[PDB]
Structures are given as C-alpha cells and as structure tokens.
Write a protein that binds this DNA or RNA. Sequence first.
RNA 1: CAUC
Length: 75
Amino acid sequence: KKVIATKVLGTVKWFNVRNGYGFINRNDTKEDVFVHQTAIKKNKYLRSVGDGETVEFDVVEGEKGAEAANVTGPG
RNA sequence: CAUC
C-alpha cells in the first residue's frame, strides 16, 4: 500500500478479462508492473485496459511486489 | 490477484 512512484506512464502488455489481471510495462524503467482489475478506475468491463494502450498510474508495494494503482488514461 |  506504500506508494513508490506516482504519475508513471506505461504501455499495457496484456490484460486478461477472464483472470482479471495483466501487466503494464513502465516507460521510464522498462519493467513490467502487475495490474489487477480493481486498480483500474471506472470507464460492461467497467474496469479494464486494452492491450497496447498507454496508461498513467501509481506504483505501490503490494503483497507480492510492485503493482499498479489508480490506473487511468494519460492525463 | 504475477507473465495468461
């Protein structure tokens, strides 16, 4: 829950709506960050992102490492 | 709810 970085831009690698998670590659470090559907803010699939989309997000310390939070479009 |  501790915030590591804010207003990070990245590219969605993939997001699977069946399993409800995916990964975003950070543009600043080129590292993948885990993203769960509950971390995406509301837009059927009210909380989802599309493969290849640019998004903005915070990076927080989750249970099993770094994960995205507050995922929006850029701006 | 960690590379589908």
